[PDB]
């Protein structure tokens, strides 16, 4: 026995707040959390306690510390079959990462609709409010490798596998409502442009390099999703606090055969929230696993990620009623024109057991639809349908990837396909072809119908010649970027200007910067001028005279495009740092922890060393991390309770911790003699909105802090932060 006698090696199998217990595989942390898919994986879960160590052939091993050798200082012998199996398996551990979205984090959960949608769709998972569909969801960045950092500036993926009773449906979306390009033929060009450059394989996780901006300057259709990327949408706080979108128009098909166009939305019930760029960039260094960690720890705490599925629905007869093409995936459908109808709720409530087996090997593909859905001719969706099956057979080693446990349907699947590498299913059917008489033609085709029917495509009319040509209706590139720009708050605009300015400053060939600023002048002259000033570029008179693009169907703005213009804050699952001293005022700590607990906000107790400190009343406080070990970047607000403030008053790291949190617009709360830290961040005696201060930490102090936290950041401080050296 190498475990400690006290049992402290094993985390409690109950919900616990971040940092309170070591994290664990999902089935051991939350063994009572079940759904049909989770249960179905029991055939392949493998335990360990009380079992002997063996080879993969079942032979017990006596000595797992040594190779077999001729004498104990002799050569290793070829007959050591136990060493060679162990080292061969290790030698073959890695598989290819995904070509894009290689970096991602996943969890299990469940979905149910609010009401039956049978009037618009015959899909079975949308038919009954009390029929629950398991899901597995992977969130991702796009450009970086599987070992890249989480809080980069990038688009994020949001892929949901729904294990329905009529097949797997994969809704493979991103966190912005449009993509960069119009036709899948260009996907390798765009991805190669954004990815590390091919001579030296730099930069990882960043679009701030010449080839990406070269492509953008030469392909104005990219500008819309570039605007989203350069805004704070490119730097979410958490995968719990971003939107999701399917991007393409799809179809819903009901039992009477009617097609309705649909775009898919996920609304985060925790609200929309993003980092600021200096925080995000520094956090890729202090904790490159911040989003993976925060997601796993939110589910271990019971702060399950919840999202509302929503549909924008457009009747068939209204296909051409907008000033943009519904099938153009560089155009969004403004919610002021077509509202999102609430459809159902998805809750992620258990982490996987083994990241490689369940997350790395999962395969999501947007051609996996079910009866009641269909595609459209969007030319980027069309080409996606070829790529996901093709790449998943390369990455997962052959055509039986649907038999890898995470990807298996929970509903029946039977057909005449056979063989392939690592075939697990042993078919007993005498026939491997149809039509057959020798098995009375089973398994059999099923006619389409209202429920449980075979799939039939909606009989869309196709009229045209065989052409490689872009629809002229797709040839407008600046109106949607402008609508997005005008819908942002002033601080969000400033952050967009700063994102383009920072990125193009890293473009070494100056003419590319100039060409991008010329594109920006076709969107908005105020944006283009503000970027140009930061680049040392002066717009020409012709640039100053470019006519702005038209409004989008009369809209001058749509506030649903902003992260912050409409309040939607939720503090449950956020975290505060509490900076301890060696004689903390216990009464402050009581009041602080009670008010945080009432709102579901977690706390991390920090100090200048690890171990414990004792409060004024004898209470022994364990320290979660040092001020340098868990920087302000990792929390949403900072509280300094009273005590022996002289202990930490001259500590550089405690002072910096407040300066960094202040620069990054976080609420700060100072009780009693902790108000002496007002001098590090230059707060006048009268106080400042976003700094909470009082003689002690009481009801009123904590309510004011929590109100600031519900607004996420203190935007009004922005003019005060350029002078702080942090």
């Amino acid at each position: 026995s190498l475990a400690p006698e006290d049992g402290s090696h094993r985390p409690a199998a109950e919900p616990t707040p971040p940092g309170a217990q070591p994290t664990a595989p999902g089935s051991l942390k939350a063994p009572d959390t079940r759904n049909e898919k989770l249960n179905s994986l029991e055939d392949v879960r493998k335990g360990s306690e009380n079992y002997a160590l063996t080879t993969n052939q079942g032979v017990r091993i006596a000595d797992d510390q040594n190779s077999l050798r001729a004498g104990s200082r002799g050569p290793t012998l070829l007959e050591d079959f136990i060493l060679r199996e162990k080292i061969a398996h290790f030698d073959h551990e890695r598989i290819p990462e995904r070509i894009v979205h290689a970096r991602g984090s996943a969890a299990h959960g469940y979905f149910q609709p609010y009401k039956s949608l049978s009037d618009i769709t015959k899909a079975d998972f949308l038919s009954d409010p009390n029929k629950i569909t398991p899901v597995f969801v992977r969130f991702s960045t796009v450009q970086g490798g599987a070992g890249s950092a989480d809080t980069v500036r990038d688009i994020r993926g949001f892929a949901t596998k729904f294990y329905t009773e009529e097949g797997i449906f994969d809704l493979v979306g991103n966190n912005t409502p449009i993509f960069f390009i119009q036709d899948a033929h260009k996907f390798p060009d765009f991805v190669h442009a954004v990815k590390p450059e091919p001579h030296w394989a730099i930069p990882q996780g960043q679009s701030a390099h010449d080839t990406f901006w070269d492509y953008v300057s030469l392909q104005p259709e990219t500008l819309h999703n570039v605007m989203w990327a350069m805004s704070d949408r490119g730097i979410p706080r958490s995968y719990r606090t971003m939107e999701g979108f399917g991007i393409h128009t799809f179809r819903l098909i009901n039992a009477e055969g009617k097609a309705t166009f649909v775009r898919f939305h996920w609304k985060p019930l925790a609200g929309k929230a993003s980092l600021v760029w200096d925080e995000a960039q520094k956090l890729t260094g202090r904790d490159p696993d911040f989003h993976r960690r925060e997601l796993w720890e939110a589910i271990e705490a019971g702060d399950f990620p919840e999202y509302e599925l929503g549909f924008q629905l457009i009747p068939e007869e209204d296909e051409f009623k907008f000033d943009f093409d519904l099938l153009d995936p560089t155009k969004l459908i403004p919610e002021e024109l077509v509202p999102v109808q609430r459809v159902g709720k998805m809750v992620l409530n258990r982490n996987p057991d083994n990241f490689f087996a369940e997350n790395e090997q999962a395969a999501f593909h947007p051609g996996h639809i079910v009866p009641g859905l269909d595609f459209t001719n969007d030319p980027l969706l069309q080409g996606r349908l070829y790529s996901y099956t093709d790449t998943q057979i390369s990455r997962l080693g052959g055509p039986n990837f649907h038999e890898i446990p995470i990807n298996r349907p929970t509903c029946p699947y039977h057909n005449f396909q056979r063989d392939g590498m690592h075939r697990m299913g042993i078919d007993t059917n005498p026939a491997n072809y149809e039509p057959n008489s020798i098995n009375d033609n089973w398994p059999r085709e099923t006619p389409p119908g209202p429920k449980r029917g075979g799939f039939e495509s909606y009989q869309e009319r196709v009229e045209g010649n065989k052409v490689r040509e872009r629809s002229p209706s797709f040839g407008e590139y600046y109106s949607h970027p402008r609508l997005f720009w005008l819908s942002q708050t002033p601080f969000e605009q400033r952050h967009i200007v700063d994102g383009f300015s920072f990125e193009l400053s890293k473009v070494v060939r100056p003419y590319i910067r100039e060409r991008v600023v010329d594109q920006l002048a076709h969107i908005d002259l105020t944006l283009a001028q503000a970027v140009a000033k930061n680049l040392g570029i002066e717009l020409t008179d012709d640039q100053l005279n470019i006519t702005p693009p038209p409004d989008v169907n009369g809209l001058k703005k749509d506030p649903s495009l902003s992260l912050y213009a409409i309040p939607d804050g939720d503090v449950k699952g956020r975290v505060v740092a509490i900076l301890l001293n060696d004689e903390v005022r216990s009464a402050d700590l009581l009041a602080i922890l009670k008010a945080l607990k009432a709102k579901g906000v977690h706390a991390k107790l920090l100090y200048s060393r690890m171990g414990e400190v004792t409060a004024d009343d004898g209470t022994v406080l364990p320290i979660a991390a040092t001020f340098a070990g868990a920087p302000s970047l990792t929390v949403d607000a900072v509280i300094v309770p009273c005590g022996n403030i002289a202990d930490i008053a001259d500590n550089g790291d405690a002072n910096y911790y407040l300066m960094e949190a202040y620069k990054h617009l976080k609420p700060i709360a100072l009780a009693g003699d902790a108000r002496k830290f007002k001098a590090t961040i230059k707060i006048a005696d009268q106080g400042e909105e976003g700094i909470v201060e009082a003689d002690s930490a009481d009801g009123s102090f904590m309510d004011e802090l929590l109100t600031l936290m519900a607004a996420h950041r203190v935007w009004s401080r922005i003019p005060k932060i350029d002078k702080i050296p942090a």
Copy 2:
């Protein structure tokens, strides 16, 4: 419904003789047959009846006859995900075949020992006569591809996977007691020499070409196994009528630590039986699947392949008591010197359900041993230990090939190995390393002991310098080929000579045939001269004067080396052709069938067309095949009953049937006017040994025939067959 109304599409789920029903997947044919391994596969067996046809994602298919197109004469659309999945799976069905032994045929069964062998081995599967161990056995040729023919001249593999309670043990043997080469380093050279030549990839399934005999002529260590391959051992009648051998000396280790050297044997309880060359060669054309078919039909009829495991046991202190090295795999241990001790019985009693999932994907490797067994320094075994794991991860797609269902142990297996392509097991252990405290060090090592202990290698002494050198004790190449030659009957020796003469005739470079005749002259002069005569080569005076090699430990023959010197016939499961006419005498047929039934001998009723014929007394006789359709090659004897003989007397195919059977030494029985056929095979009026004849088919006509079948072939006919034009 496409099945016929009378149900005649479905084979009866009970034992039936070959030809009486269509063959079927083993769990449908014999649902009541079970063992622990067959039970454990049930979780991956897939049915078919009454299920809908789906994609692999579980979506029901409505039209499995057509691609999606724009108009019914239009182009196929990329959005047809059901076509693309079905075609992608088909496109990736094949996996690499095995480098050697690619052609092979397998079945499930069980093994039990006759008594506990605990005094000599602590192997669990040999510890208790009530302990039943499931097996899976694959028999194979060596040189040809998976789609080559079965009845070629080649060595045969005989590989047994024992699913024990202490691990998988794979006994990976062949049907001769030695191999061609001494050191594994030469295996690619020898296999490249026997395989199809590299410019043009000819010939398939044949050693009769220049490179093979070039190698043989230059590597006299090969001559021992070459003698076996050129004997009728190279052309077995069935996998059920051949011996098996582990070849190498291995060790048994008992609970007290004592090592005993062992060589493994399988004794066919159906007896030893081979074809003759002209019959085998022609049968590769008439039925290239003959041995696969015979094995599967024997198991469907209940003629289960049975084999007795036996051990030759040599004490450690007798290592050097022989004229040859125990560790040299080109030497056999004569049974006259060290008897085979009977160990237990293996019965093969169920066919697979799916050939590719269970046969093609099975992986046997001789390094898979269990506590109670160990290796020796045989330098061909030593290098095998590297090859099998290496090649199986290449062929089966990654390091998780033990999770393919046929390969999985039935006993527990738990370790710290993770990931790899196709990973099925989902580990819940918090640790993936040891030593660990975080899971209290589980799964844990187990010390060696008398049962259920960890594996520990026997502490053999090693002393010598690091050298690439053959042991001088291995440098004797001719004594064991001579012992084999002298142990054969005179007709077995004729067929050896004819095997070398035919194969060397197909070597285009004459000097290679001369060099191989020179090697034969070092084994035995009568052999050498008889082959030389057939090649037009004259021995030199010096060749006529080479001194024969020494006897082996005083032996000038060992009759256990001969197929036929000691009768071990068994007629059960053999087959007779019955040549019908349009008015058969029914009393003849009743007697024939009743006597054959009583000895478990099958029959096939042949005619000049399919359908039925009617007997003298009105009995309707169903025809199994035409004369041309089921040639004499495929049966053990031929019976022609009386009746309207004029119906078939001038039928070329019926006369030819008897001439082929006659040439190949098969018993032939002629009743009543069927005696007219004596003229086509030139039999005298007074008869000859091997031709049974009488006014009717009984009293003793069937006993006489069945006695001839017990002796397999009519060797005394040999001098008569050269005159027959067949």
Copy 3:
């Protein structure tokens, strides 16, 4: 005419200091720097300028901007073999990364001995001071993926392929003179313990987690290389300013058959230098490619990495 008319898109083919010009493929930046290995690769180098765009089967492409569809707003057709080949190649670009040392940066160069070592070794590449051996060198971290950060705290790999006249010799070393473990049987245990933990796959590029220190606390043989990793050896300023070591004792064999034990070293002629931890950890965020970049730009500037 997408290039600027002033030609400022193309870097000068002469040594230039970091940042002065866009970086480029070696054969375009320094066409006149040659060695026998670099010359032998000319058979497979592919240019681009002035050539038509083609499929991999050599068919010229007319419109690389659009898929073939029935009507310009219609469905994409299966017959579009140009789109299918281009997206099939893209779909299969990635190969598995190295199980360890997945993150690395490499360059070409050459080796010459100072004098003949025929007295102690018959290795042909050490037999003559005028015999130049081309090399290719890869420097690496150990634990993180290929897309992890360069200035982590970790051991570094220093692998040199010598293309000799009597065969390839690979000297596969690290930047500290010992390893963490004694017997290869334990290498999957130790690597599993330092790698991201298996439930959640955290942390990347760091040994600062429970399983690593669990293994170290139970296997005191690891403490010597742990000391080196916790020192500033674990955070080099550049691959140019660290030492290299083969770690193991090997043998040299001379023509007379005498064996001498040897351990191999590389001394950085630019000196030894390391970062400090707060700087290295921050730099993993501000520039995760800092060591790859610095090596590439040192070579483009003429500040060639040299090692003895």
Copy 4:
């Protein structure tokens, strides 16, 4: 791609074109060709957009599909003319 080990099967010597072939496709298992293009995407400025598209024409032109007229609904249906 399954049978020959990856997407560079056209680099296996028997399958190589004898005419020029140049494009922006990169990587894949057993990649033989070492591309020197600064660009691996188009449109690009950094290599003056090379290698470049070629319009269709009477000789040495790029490939353009014959502009067949397609009219019909999306159906899984066999032409009656094939019955």
